[PDB]
From a paper:
The OXA-48 carbapenemase is widely disseminated in Enterobacterales, necessitating new treatments for producer strains. OXA-48 is a class D SBL that uses a nucleophilic serine (Ser70) to hydrolyse β-lactams, with a proximal post-translationally carbamylated lysine (Lys73) proposed to act as the general base for both the acylation and deacylation steps of the reaction. Diazabicyclooctane (DBO) inhibitors, including avibactam and nacubactam, act on a wide range of enzymes to overcome β-lactamase-mediated resistance. Here we describe investigations on how avibactam and nacubactam inhibit OXA-48 and two variants, OXA-163 and OXA-405, with deletions in the β5–β6 loop neighbouring the active site that modify activity towards different β-lactam classes.
A crystal structure of nacubactam bound to homodimeric OXA-48 was solved at 1.51 Å resolution, from a crystal soaked with nacubactam for 30 min before freezing, with a chloride ion positioned at the dimer interface, as observed previously. Continuous positive Fo–Fc electron density between the ligand and Ser70 indicates the presence of a covalently bound nacubactam-derived carbamoyl-enzyme complex. The avibactam and nacubactam carbamoyl-enzyme complexes show a similar binding mode to OXA-48, with the nacubactam C7 carbonyl group positioned within the oxyanion hole formed by the backbone amides of residues Ser70 and Tyr211, as seen in β-lactam-derived acyl-enzyme complexes of OXA-48-like enzymes. In contrast, when Leu158 adopts the g-rotamer, observed when nacubactam is bound, the channel is closed, and the adjacent water is modelled in dual occupancy with the Leu158 side-chain, due we infer to steric clashes (Leu158 Cδ2 is ∼1.8 Å away from this water molecule). When OXA-48 is bound to nacubactam, in the active site of chain B, Arg214 of the Ω-loop adopts two conformations. In both conformations, the Arg214 side chain is poorly resolved in the final 2Fo–Fc electron density map. Thus, it is possible that the side chain of Arg214 and the C2 tail nitrogen of nacubactam are electrostatically repelled in crystallo due to clashing positive charges. Chain A of the nacubactam complex, in contrast, does not show this effect, most likely due to a crystal packing contact, whereby residue Glu132 from an adjacent molecule in a different asymmetric unit can electrostatically interact with Arg214, thus holding it in place. Consequently, the C2 tail group of nacubactam adopts a dual conformation in the chain A active site, presumably as a result of electrostatic repulsion by the Arg214 side chain. The structural studies reveal conformational variability of this loop only in the OXA-48 : nacubactam complex, as a result of electrostatic repulsion between the C2 tail nitrogen of the nacubactam 1-aminoethoxy group and the side chain of Arg214.
Author numbering:
A (entry chain B), B (entry chain A): 21 to 265
The structure:
Amino acid sequence: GPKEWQENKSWNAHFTEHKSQGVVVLWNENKQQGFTNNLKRANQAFLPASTFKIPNSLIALDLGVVKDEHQVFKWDGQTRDIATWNRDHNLITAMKYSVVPVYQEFARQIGEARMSKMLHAFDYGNEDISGNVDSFWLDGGIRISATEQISFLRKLYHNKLHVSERSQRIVKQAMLTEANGDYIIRAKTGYSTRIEPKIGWWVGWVELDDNVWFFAMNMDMPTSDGLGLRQAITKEVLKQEKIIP
Amino acid sequence: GPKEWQENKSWNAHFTEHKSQGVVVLWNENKQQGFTNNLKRANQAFLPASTFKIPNSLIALDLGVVKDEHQVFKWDGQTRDIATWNRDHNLITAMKYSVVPVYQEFARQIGEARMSKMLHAFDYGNEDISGNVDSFWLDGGIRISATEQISFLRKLYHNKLHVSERSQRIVKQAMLTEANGDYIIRAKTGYSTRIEPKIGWWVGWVELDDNVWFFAMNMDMPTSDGLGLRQAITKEVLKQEKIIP
Ligand SMILES: *C(=O)N1C[C@H](NOS(=O)(=O)O)CC[C@H]1C(=O)NOCCN
Ligand SMILES: *C(=O)N1C[C@H](NOS(=O)(=O)O)CC[C@H]1C(=O)NOCCN
Ligand SMILES: [Cl-]
Ligand SMILES: [Cl-]
Ligand SMILES: [Cl-]
């Protein structure tokens, strides 16, 4: 009978066409079935890098570190390499421009004891926060696979994480990436650069009228010049599968 | 001293270019200033028609008539003129396809006494539900102006309406119309067809990185062939004002 996970190796052509290597994982929520070009890499756990902004946001909101999505976190005045980081942000714009220093402040205020407890409650990856509480997702011990990202996102979608429904709704709002009459994408990018292998991430879901497709992709990323391929390769797969036009 | 409300008659050219007549009203939230091509029509009160799905959704959720935005409302098997209505819906798709029969059932469950009480609590328009409990917003006594639509939407944006924050967040999600890196539009269309003058509505807001612009427009609409002009004329104004590219 039907399998929970199937391999579609033809998706490899979208990686090969872009001289890239990696994995796309899709989950069809209505059918409760998943699909991937590489089931082994789908289960390979990596540093989450900026995709950790999703659980970090949830925990900061539920503990009151962040009051709501419009509370301002002022620039600390240190000029950093990414110009959009050198300004004041709220939760929405800090996720959109992936403003690491704002989320490091969130993590410091959460603190290691509460961070560990909440990642255990979330069943999140290997749940390991060894390192600095404000960098373990960049250069510490936490690891999460693409399929574990989907597991986490499915709980978030259904408001079933062990945090308030309010925090889950706010974070799903902050994840909004694209919307038109054909679909809504809620997602977060990431780029793990400090520990080899350097990889790019894109995790989230596509909302249709009558279904939701969760996705999690990662790919080898030796330089930042290829970062647009995270979304491009994913969208090529979504187009091949007739999920988006 | 600066003016809270200012008239910009140059927007009339966008109506004339499309052989149309109507009003666009904008509110700049950061500046606390409003702008319109027609100050009198901005304050004239009309039937809300399908823009009433915003307060109706809020009331249905807060009263428990609708449990959440994924609860399925099954098609009643009656084949109606609009093909997208002849389907099962949830709150998200019922708002998107503006599925009147679903919202008439909400209104019947709410009932006259609770509907009236809640519209008074919302300060919604003239607060008058005279007529049929399931059609007063189409052919009964309720009236709301474009400026009153903005007032109501600003309360919704800030979670200040007299319903749970949860219901307000769910409805703001259901209002999602378009999103890209440049802006998010949350809005609801309507077409008042039963009492003259027939008018098209578009009410909502445009979220930018650092500001939000509320808008409410209505325009004479003798035929459904012109309904695309509601968004087109509004967007021409937003482009003229450099709010969207
Ligand atoms: C997170 O992965 N970040 C922050 C920022 N994210 O941009 S995105 O990859 O488009 O979401 C830039 C890349 C990455 C970092 O540079 N983080 O700090 C160093 C650890 N990789
Ligand atoms: C509400 O304004 N409705 C329902 C539907 N809305 O579509 S929209 O105008 O694009 O938002 C069509 C127009 C209008 C009605 O006609 N409603 O009356 C009951 C069905 N004729
Ligand atoms: Cl981060
Ligand atoms: Cl949203
Ligand atoms: Cl309606």
